[PDB]
Structures are given as C-alpha cells and as structure tokens.
Design a protein around this ligand. Structure first.
Ligand SMILES: [Zn+2]
Length: 235
DNA sequence: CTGTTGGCAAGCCAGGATCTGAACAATACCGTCATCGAGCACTGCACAGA
C-alpha cells in the first residue's frame, strides 16, 4: 500500500454481519452540517458529497469552505473553535470526502496540504454554478410535471458535475495570472468563459429532448431562468 | 486591289377592398453497489466389484 518496509504485515481479516440502531444524531466535531427546520424541531444532517463533489485543482479547500460559509450549512466544531480563538486569523481547510453509490465509490475529492482574490474567484465560480442549477432544476421539475420519464428529471445533477470538470480547465491559467493589477481583468475574462460554459452545458443537458413539442414551455422557462441569473452575475 | 461619315433616342399619370388560418391521442423497459450462508447444480476421482 505504501511501499515501505515493515516487520509485521497483515494479509487478511475476518468480518460478519452486525446491525444495531443509533437514534438521534451524535455531535461529531469533525464535519460540517446542514440545518433544516421541519415542523417546530431543528434537524441537522452532516454534509456529504451527494450528487456532486465540488472541486477545483489547487483550491478545492476554498470551494468547499465557501459552500459551507454561504450556501443552512454550518462549520465543523473544530473550525468553530478556531474562529473563536483567532477571529482575525486566516483560515484554510484540510478536507475530504467520497461520492458513492452504496458500496461503490464513484468519486474522491481531498485537499491535504500543509488569497482574497482566490476567495473572489471561488465566489464567482459558485455563482455561475448556481445559475446553471436553478435553470436545469426548473427544466427537470417541468419535465417531471409533464409526466415525462427518463433521465430528464436529473439533468441538473449531471450538468453540475460537468460544470466543475469543464471549469477546472480554466483554473490553472487563472491562478497563474493573478496579481494586484491583473486581478480584475482575469476575473472578468473568467466570467465571460463561465457564462459561455453555462450556456453550452445547458444546451448539452437539454439536447436529448429536442423535438419534444410538449416540453417547449418547460424548456423556454428554463432558458429564461438561466439568462435571468446570468445577467445578475455581471457586475 | 479597294467597304464611309454626322446627327438624333420623349413626356404625363395611375397599383384596391372584403374575410377566413383546426382538432384528438400517444413519449417504454433492463443491467452495468455489496454482503452472508444456505440450498442445490457441473465435474472430475479414482476405484471394487460387476
Ligand atoms: Zn504501508
């Protein structure tokens, strides 16, 4: 596994089925959580990479940090402590998680290494991500309400995954050219790029349902939603 | 063998209205996680004794 020499090396183990039930939610201090209020009670759910694993090369920790900071998400208890001990000190994460289909691991995202522009870049990135999601969720819902079947009800999931992968290609050049005087220019260029990408991904996600006349109002509403949110992103 | 030149080519005025443009029914399903032990199959294994 590691390639190092070792006196003792294990080669197998034994396991057996074993079940129980933990009622309630144990206050684990190492994970951020989502706060939801159902009925009058407060519900918490620990964060997990569900249908996407938000990540960019070099700055994945910043992407995850901002999602917790902005999108009912709450920071981990160990992070909450550090903020209270040093409120003015800059805070970066060491983070990781898996995307899974039951026993199968589909995706791994980990940032393990031991600035405001980067925050701005990530903030901009997430904005276009959100614009795309709202547009395609609008399509997916309309697709569902129109009694249509198939993968049309989750096109917002695939397109979100494709968003991060297609935009990751832009990141190295962006990071390489960032400095005091060039920051506003490279971020503006990033916006145009991400604007174009969102349009492409929208069209790509929706392409298999061309010539479905009953879906034209759903498609039209979805694209109008996209451009509404894209316009709100240009400063 | 030898075949030409000048001068000249128009203007007026006029192009429409009525009224009409559809409806129904139908858009799929499967598989591409895993676990455990059991109940029940190919499948060769020599043989012992036929
Ligand atoms: Zn090792």
């Amino acid at each position: 596994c590691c390639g190092q020499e070792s006196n003792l090396r294990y080669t197998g183990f034994l396991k057996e089925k074993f079940t129980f039930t933990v009622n309630g939610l144990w206050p684990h201090p190492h994970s951020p959580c989502l706060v939801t209020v159902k009925k009058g009670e407060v519900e918490e759910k620990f964060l997990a990479f569900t249908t996407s694993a938000p990540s960019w090369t070099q700055i994945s920790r910043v992407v995850v940090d901002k999602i917790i900071q902005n999108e009912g998400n709450r920071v981990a208890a160990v992070v909450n402590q550090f903020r209270n001990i040093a409120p003015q000190s800059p805070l970066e994460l060491i983070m990781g998680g898996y995307r899974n289909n039951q026993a199968s691991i589909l995706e791994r995202r980990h940032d393990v290494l031991m600035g405001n522009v980067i925050n701005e870049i990530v903030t901009v990135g997430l904005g276009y991500k959100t614009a795309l999601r709202k547009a395609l969720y609008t399509f997916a819902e309309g697709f569902k309400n129109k009694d249509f079947k198939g993968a049309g009800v989750s096109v917002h999931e695939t397109a979100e995954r494709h968003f991060y992968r297609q935009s990751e290609l832009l990141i190295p050049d962006v990071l390489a050219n960032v400095n005091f005087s060039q920051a506003d220019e490279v971020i503006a260029d990033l916006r145009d790029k991400l604007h174009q990408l969102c349009e492409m991904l929208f069209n790509q996600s929706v392409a298999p349902y061309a010539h479905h006349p009953k879906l034209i109002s759903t498609l039209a509403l979805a694209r109008a939603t996209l451009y509404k949110h894209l316009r709100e992103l240009k400063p």
